[PDB]
Design an enzyme around this catalytic site. Structure first.
Site, PDB file in Angstrom:
ATOM      1  N   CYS A 156     -22.086  28.724  -0.993  1.00 45.71           N
ATOM      2  CA  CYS A 156     -22.193  27.661   0.002  1.00 45.71           C
ATOM      3  C   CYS A 156     -23.474  27.807   0.813  1.00 45.71           C
ATOM      4  O   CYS A 156     -23.651  28.796   1.531  1.00 45.71           O
ATOM      5  CB  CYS A 156     -20.995  27.649   0.951  1.00 45.71           C
ATOM      6  SG  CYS A 156     -21.266  26.494   2.309  1.00 45.71           S
ATOM      7  N   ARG A 211     -23.455  27.609   5.296  1.00 45.81           N
ATOM      8  CA  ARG A 211     -22.652  28.563   6.064  1.00 45.81           C
ATOM      9  C   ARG A 211     -23.182  28.849   7.460  1.00 45.81           C
ATOM     10  O   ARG A 211     -22.588  29.677   8.155  1.00 45.81           O
ATOM     11  CB  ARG A 211     -22.538  29.877   5.292  1.00 45.81           C
ATOM     12  CG  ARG A 211     -21.663  29.791   4.067  1.00 45.81           C
ATOM     13  CD  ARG A 211     -21.593  31.130   3.389  1.00 45.81           C
ATOM     14  NE  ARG A 211     -22.725  31.371   2.492  1.00 45.81           N
ATOM     15  CZ  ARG A 211     -22.972  32.555   1.946  1.00 45.81           C
ATOM     16  NH1 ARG A 211     -22.166  33.583   2.219  1.00 45.81           N
ATOM     17  NH2 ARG A 211     -24.013  32.725   1.132  1.00 45.81           N
ATOM     18  N   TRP A 238     -20.071  18.226   5.971  1.00 48.62           N
ATOM     19  CA  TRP A 238     -20.887  17.039   5.771  1.00 48.62           C
ATOM     20  C   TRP A 238     -21.738  17.277   4.543  1.00 48.62           C
ATOM     21  O   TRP A 238     -21.874  18.412   4.081  1.00 48.62           O
ATOM     22  CB  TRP A 238     -21.752  16.709   6.993  1.00 48.62           C
ATOM     23  CG  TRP A 238     -22.493  17.870   7.506  1.00 48.62           C
ATOM     24  CD1 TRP A 238     -23.714  18.324   7.075  1.00 48.62           C
ATOM     25  CD2 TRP A 238     -22.082  18.749   8.558  1.00 48.62           C
ATOM     26  NE1 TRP A 238     -24.083  19.428   7.801  1.00 48.62           N
ATOM     27  CE2 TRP A 238     -23.097  19.718   8.712  1.00 48.62           C
ATOM     28  CE3 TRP A 238     -20.953  18.820   9.377  1.00 48.62           C
ATOM     29  CZ2 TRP A 238     -23.019  20.738   9.659  1.00 48.62           C
ATOM     30  CZ3 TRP A 238     -20.877  19.833  10.319  1.00 48.62           C
ATOM     31  CH2 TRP A 238     -21.903  20.782  10.447  1.00 48.62           C
ATOM     32  N   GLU A 296     -26.284  16.536  -3.187  1.00 52.41           N
ATOM     33  CA  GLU A 296     -25.001  16.539  -3.882  1.00 52.41           C
ATOM     34  C   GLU A 296     -24.640  15.136  -4.336  1.00 52.41           C
ATOM     35  O   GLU A 296     -24.000  14.961  -5.378  1.00 52.41           O
ATOM     36  CB  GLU A 296     -23.890  17.094  -2.986  1.00 52.41           C
ATOM     37  CG  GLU A 296     -24.147  18.453  -2.354  1.00 52.41           C
ATOM     38  CD  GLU A 296     -23.044  18.823  -1.351  1.00 52.41           C
ATOM     39  OE1 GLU A 296     -21.925  19.158  -1.801  1.00 52.41           O
ATOM     40  OE2 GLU A 296     -23.276  18.741  -0.121  1.00 52.41           O
TER      41      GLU A 296
END
Ligand code: HEM
Ligand code: HEM
Ligand SMILES: Cc1cc(N)nc(COc2cc(CCN3CC(F)C3)cc(F)c2F)c1
Ligand SMILES: Cc1cc(N)nc(COc2cc(CCN3CC(F)C3)cc(F)c2F)c1
Ligand SMILES: C[C@H](O)[C@H](O)[C@H]1CNc2nc(N)[nH]c(=O)c2N1
Ligand SMILES: C[C@H](O)[C@H](O)[C@H]1CNc2nc(N)[nH]c(=O)c2N1
Ligand SMILES: [Zn+2]
Lengths: 415, 415
Positions: free
Chosen positions: B113, B116, B285, B290
């Site tokens: 991720c 973070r 969000w 992506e």
């Protein structure tokens, strides 16, 4: 003992059994993956005579297996022949054919190389009779001339004598045969290639009269048999260059950029049957992105995204206007268009990454696998619109292989 | 025992000692790096009561260490309290504060991720009193409403009851709370999101009347306490969507694309102190890429690069005209511009990757390291013009953690 790699764009599954023949270690453990450390201690290179024969035996066993004559008498004789010579001399010498095999398979096993679909079409120049820096210079000029082939680039490697003691050591001090010079300026900023500022000053430390401009082709620094290295200018007619223009933007010529046709890596170590070849410059042709993305746009390189976006009239206040990405694509359209308009071999990251997938299919079928470093195989732009992004890849370290080695100016007992 | 990671763009060195606290395995060995396998068998999830207390003890030891009260009596009492309850019930229950801690640190430890830097600003919704699919639906609607916050997105997680036996199991069958439907057509081609074609037909298998168009928000499929899952439509007023326009190209509206504001992953397993939470949807969000790279441009997704390049009037015969890259950048400029013009929180890959480097500096100083998956942290476009490309990252598996799990429709003993 029979690992599966998936392609999540095509749902294709390959089965890797080649990793079982693997030998060297990776740096990763059961509790830590180091697949993104740039220079793992396992990828860098001094051996004795005891460990030498298993390495030789292992190499000969796969070499004779590949000429369809494994375990035969010609094999078992060469096994003993090299055995005897390792007893006598605590080293040995490869046959010409064993040297060509070892070189091609070092490239074949190079898991960070996306170009490997051509690994069998490698021209091997045996420079193991070389004894002087002038001899090296002469062998390297011939390499450059041949590999360039007037823009119709051909893969080649030139293999200087193997390490013996260690203090007698052939080394090309250049990281590439053809690199542009880097000069620190009064204000601290950098003219030319900032990557080479350290090497550029070493050449001036040994006598180079620098034309202190941008794309100044560096001289070769050649160490022969452990002697202090010596300066040689590649004849400019042998250094083929592409001026960089765009097929839309006519101001792109005013950028005045150019690059050399021949990527020719010279600082690596070739390991074959336990033998270490500390000077083995090899060359192919460029993938577009190595120049247009990394060379031209790395913050630590030429760093041109500023000037390209300016001349493109780009929203440069907001990070989120993606002016950096927008200028990066145009720069890579220009490198490709420039190289192809001059009949200099170049490959775009889409064609090269598609070929690598095709290559992987070949290596899994007729070899049982293909070691591949995803971190390095995915191109530095538009990664997921290329097939390698979606291909799982098993990285493992086979031999013969190219390894890193420390720069000679940190280890060379000078004078 | 004290590993160094380098940034090759800045020559910054961080020292990782946090990997020593690591527990779980990675899939890599000394002889093979699997850092590019998508779903390693180590990242996927049935435990007994014996192994439960070390996992609980380990979790409590770091929890009380983090409220500045390690090894105290309030700690040693809760150690015994959970010990006793594991003897009696062969499981136990987290305190609210232990649940909030575990959740935030599962996110904190999520090495793939990039987001973070916000891990401590996570809103934890305790849904462990839920008993029915309607209860889940109600908790999920509240999650959606809160996390959306009218475009001012906020991080949140909703934690349904922990697994016990296994056959009593809360599961959200949707991979994300908000996904568009995928329908196979007569000719075989796909309308909507081809990723969800399998799930879209499962919803029709259970009663969903499909409006068989493009961006049809799927219904939730909610399994409560191992019962057969049930269909619920998120109230459309709760599903915030961004229509996608460009700030130059006015034909970009005619493309008619839109996306949902809220990325809300629902199929993962949250592990805390050895306890398995099989339904734990969490949301944040979007990073621009992506949607604009992976959702819009993957060959196996909406696959719009064709139509965008056509309307851009792009040289599409030659692969090397980089029309694919050129259209990819515009698409991502449009997603960003569209989201920001509607005050829906979105981050571009440059800002998000810079924040992650800043985050890594924090985690190495005040924590001793930051587990990070380079394969996943580098954005899927323009990777090397972002700082994460040039940052070495140590991947290792800490706990509390989010893990993958098999889809419920392959394991659910139906009816
Ligand atoms: C023929 C065209 C070739 C292409 C298009 C190509 C492409 C590439 C690229 C893009 C990389 C990544 C390195 C970087 O980004 O700086 C790479 C790495 C590499 N290539 Fe190839 N290459 C070619 C030829 C060759 C040849 C002829 C050899 C050896 C005889 C070779 C051996 C290697 C090695 C050793 C690496 C680096 C692995 C490491 O860093 O450990 N390549 N190549
Ligand atoms: C707040 C804004 C956030 C951003 C910008 C963000 C960004 C990302 C991105 C780009 C990925 C790569 C996954 C993909 O490309 O499909 C990812 C993965 C992930 N994120 Fe974050 N995320 C955010 C919030 C969260 C939250 C709130 C959690 C948990 C509470 C979380 C946990 C994870 C996990 C578990 C993964 C996947 C790791 C794996 O596949 O094993 N993220 N995130
Ligand atoms: C023959 C050929 C053709 C082609 N197109 N590209 C290449 C790039 O090969 C290599 C590139 C690098 C770059 C190392 N990086 C670390 C330092 F910061 C630069 C190392 C290496 F060991 C290589 F082999 C080679
Ligand atoms: C909260 C949040 C915000 C944000 N912007 N993005 C994400 C993406 O997170 C995840 C994304 C995926 C994608 C898995 N891939 C494998 C399949 F082919 C899709 C898995 C996962 F387990 C995640 F957690 C999450
Ligand atoms: C930190 C990271 O290992 C480093 O930046 C790597 C990433 N992947 C790469 N991939 C290629 N082809 N070339 C590189 O130099 C790098 N650099
Ligand atoms: C094969 C490879 O592991 C797979 O395509 C990975 C690569 N890196 C990724 N990185 C992110 N953020 N998301 C992904 O889905 C993937 N996919
Ligand atoms: Zn690994």
């Amino acid at each position: 003992r029979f690992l599966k790699v998936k392609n999540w764009e095509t749902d294709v599954v390959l089965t890797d059994t080649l990793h079982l023949k693997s030998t060297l270690e990776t740096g990763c453990t059961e509790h830590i993956c180091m697949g993104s450390i740039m220079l793992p201690s396992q990828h860098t290179r001094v051996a004795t005579k005891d460990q030498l024969f298993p390495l030789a035996k292992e190499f000969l066993d796969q070499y004779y297996s590949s000429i369809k004559r494994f375990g035969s008498k010609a094999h078992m004789d060469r096994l003993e022949e090299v055995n005897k010579e390792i007893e006598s001399t605590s080293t040995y010498q490869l046959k010409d054919t064993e040297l060509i095999y070892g070189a091609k398979h070092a490239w074949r096993n190079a898991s960070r190389c996306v170009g490997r679909i051509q690994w069998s079409k490698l021209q091997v120049f045996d420079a193991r009779d070389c004894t002087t820096a002038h001899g090296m210079f002469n062998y390297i000029c011939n390499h450059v001339k041949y590999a360039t082939n007037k823009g119709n680039l051909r893969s080649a490697i030139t293999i200087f004598p193997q390490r013996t003691d260690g203090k007698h050591d052939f080394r090309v001090w250049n990281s590439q045969l053809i690199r542009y010079a880097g000069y620190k300026q009064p204000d601290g900023s950098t003219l030319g290639d900032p990557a080479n500022v350290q090497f550029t000053e070493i050449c001036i430390q040994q006598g180079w009269k620098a034309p202190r401009g941008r794309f100044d082709v560096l001289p070769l620094l050649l160490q022969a048999n452990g002697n202090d290295p010596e300066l040689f200018q590649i004849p400019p007619e042998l250094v083929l260059e592409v001026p960089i223009r765009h097929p839309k933007f006519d101001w792109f010529k005013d950028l005045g950029l150019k690059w050399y046709g021949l990527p020719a890596v010279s600082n690596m170590l070739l390991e074959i049957g336990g033998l270490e070849f500390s000077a083995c410059p090899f060359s192919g042709w460029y993938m577009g992105t190595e120049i247009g993305v990394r060379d031209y746009c790395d913050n630590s390189r030429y760093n041109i995204l500023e000037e390209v976006a300016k001349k493109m009239d780009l929203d440069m206040r907001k990070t989120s206007s993606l002016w950096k990405d927008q200028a990066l694509v145009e720069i890579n359209i220009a490198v490709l268009y420039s190289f192809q308009s001059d009949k200099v071999t170049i490959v775009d990251h889409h064609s090269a990454t598609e070929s690598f997938i095709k290559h992987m299919e070949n290596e899994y079928r007729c070899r049982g696998g293909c070691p591949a470093d995803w971190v390095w195989i995915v191109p530095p732009m538009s990664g997921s619109i290329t097939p390698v992004f979606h291909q799982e890849m098993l990285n493992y370290r086979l031999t013969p292989s190219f390894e890193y080695q420390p720069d000679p100016w940190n280890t060379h007992v000078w004078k």
